[PDB]
Amino acid sequence: ARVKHFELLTDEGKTFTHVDLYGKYTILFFFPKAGTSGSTREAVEFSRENFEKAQVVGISRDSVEALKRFKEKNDLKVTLLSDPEGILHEFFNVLENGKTVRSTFLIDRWGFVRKEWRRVKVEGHVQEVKEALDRLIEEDLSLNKHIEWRRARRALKKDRVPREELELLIKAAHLAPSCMNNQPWRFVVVDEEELLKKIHEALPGGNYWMKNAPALIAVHSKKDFDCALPDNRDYFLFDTGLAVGNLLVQATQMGLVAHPVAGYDPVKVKEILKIPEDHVLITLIAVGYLGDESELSEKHRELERSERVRKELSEIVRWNL
């Protein structure tokens, strides 16, 4: 769970709070009492490592003065928290039979606990924690796996997608932010065969692959549904884009292809789906489980099995001036 708001004094008499957890990874190590052999070893061993993108914080029920002495005598280079009242000891549930059970936690940049060790054995502990931290940082500070995996796949199974799954795609989309929280996005989820077959007639030849999709999501909006600000800053389609971005990530996580297209007759599709004529039908999203690439044109099959194609980063981003 997330670490609650709190305030504790450090070995330096300073106030350490939840805010001091934010923006860093934290190794939080609970020890029973400053000065003992095992706890001295643990603190010294944590102190002598160099943790990439993390801080080390020791915590016990000791007094500030005791912790200060503990640090001074061992030349410790970590923060120590005095928790005489056991506020965090209780929150992390490290007390048993009234005594502290040596325990260690990894906390992320939002303050969420990501890993724990209970009934810690000091021998080998720091190295195990170090290795777990490196793995956690590798996981979080690398490209999101769903963003990376999402492709404009065109091979779709005909198997029906359960409505509860389709609905989750919409729920995720709806959690996008928007100007003034206008939420300008609108969706028509189509999973009725007869309706689908009518929409198929409004598709160009190159979108034959959409005909396998057991579901299509029509995404529409209207300018006055959102902010329209100076210098041509109309937000309705941008914000709807934020929503569809979420939708594709959610689909990819769920093992669904969600492929937004522009290839269709908008007037016909709006007519079929009874979408107001003054709305923009900005995309039609084909949704389905992954199917059989051998049904695709050679061109589409090659796009599908080939690597991502993008401009060099320098063509789309500049740093300062």
310 is in an annotated binding site: yes
Q: Which residue, 142, 145, 144, is CA-closest to 134? A: 142
Check if the beta carbon of residue 101 is closer than 8 Å to that of residue 95.
yes
* CB of residue 235 to ligand FMN, shortest distance in Å: 5
The listed partner (ligand FMN, a second copy, none) that binds 228, CB under 5 to 8 Å by sort, is none
Measured between alpha carbons, how far is 198 from 240 in angstroms, rounded to an integer? 25
Which single residue brings its beta carbon nearest to ligand FMN?
263
The listed partner (a second copy, ligand FMN, none) that binds 321, CB under 5 to 8 Å by sort, is a second copy
Check if the beta carbon of residue 115 is closer than 8 Å to that of residue 25.
no
* CB of residue 39 to a second copy, shortest distance in Å: 30
Measured between alpha carbons, how far is 255 from 222 in angstroms, rounded to an integer? 31
Check if the beta carbon of residue 46 is closer than 8 Å to that of residue 58.
yes
* CB of residue 312 to ligand FMN, shortest distance in Å: 15
Q: Smaller CB distance to ligand FMN: residue 262 or 290?
A: 262
308 is in an annotated binding site: yes
Q: Smaller CB distance to ligand FMN: residue 125 or 153?
A: 153
* CB of residue 37 to a second copy, shortest distance in Å: 36
Q: Smaller CB distance to ligand FMN: residue 135 or 229?
A: 229
The listed partner (a second copy, ligand FMN, none) that binds 192, CB under 5 to 8 Å by sort, is a second copy
What φ, ψ does residue 26 adopt, rounded to 5°?
-125, 130
Distances in whole angstroms, Cα of residue 38 to Cα of each of 45, 51, 95, 103, 295: 10, 21, 18, 13, 65
* CB of residue 230 to a second copy, shortest distance in Å: 7
The listed partner (a second copy, ligand FMN, none) that binds 171, CB under 5 to 8 Å by sort, is a second copy
255 is in an annotated binding site: no
State the burial class of residue 237 (Cβ atoms within 10 Å of its Cβ: 0-12, 13-18, 19+).
middle
152 is in an annotated binding site: yes
What φ, ψ does residue 14 adopt, rounded to 5°?
-85, 160
Helices (H), 95-214: 125-140, 145-149, 163-174, 193-200
Q: Smaller CB distance to ligand FMN: residue 151 or 157?
A: 151
* CB of residue 166 to ligand FMN, shortest distance in Å: 20
- Provide CB contacts within 8 A for 196, sequence distance 6+: 190, 213, 214, 216
Chain positions contacting ligand FMN, by CB under 6 A: 151-152, 154, 177-179, 181, 207, 235, 239, 242, 260-263, 283, 308
Q: Which residue, 34, 10, 29, is CA-closest to 20? A: 10
213 is in an annotated binding site: no
Maximum distance among all alpha carbons in the chain? 81
263 is in an annotated binding site: yes
206 is in an annotated binding site: no
Compute and round to an integer the Cα radius of gyration of the chain: 28
The listed partner (a second copy, ligand FMN, none) that binds 274, CB under 5 to 8 Å by sort, is a second copy
Measured between alpha carbons, how far is 106 from 313 in angstroms, rounded to an integer? 34
The listed partner (a second copy, ligand FMN, none) that binds 207, CB under 5 to 8 Å by sort, is ligand FMN
150 is in an annotated binding site: yes
* 142 three-class SS: coil
The listed partner (a second copy, ligand FMN, none) that binds 273, CB under 5 to 8 Å by sort, is a second copy
2 is in an annotated binding site: no
Binding-site residues from annotation for FMN: 150-152, 154, 207, 209, 259, 262-263, 308, 310
Binding-site residues from annotation: 150-152, 154, 207, 209, 259, 262-263, 308, 310
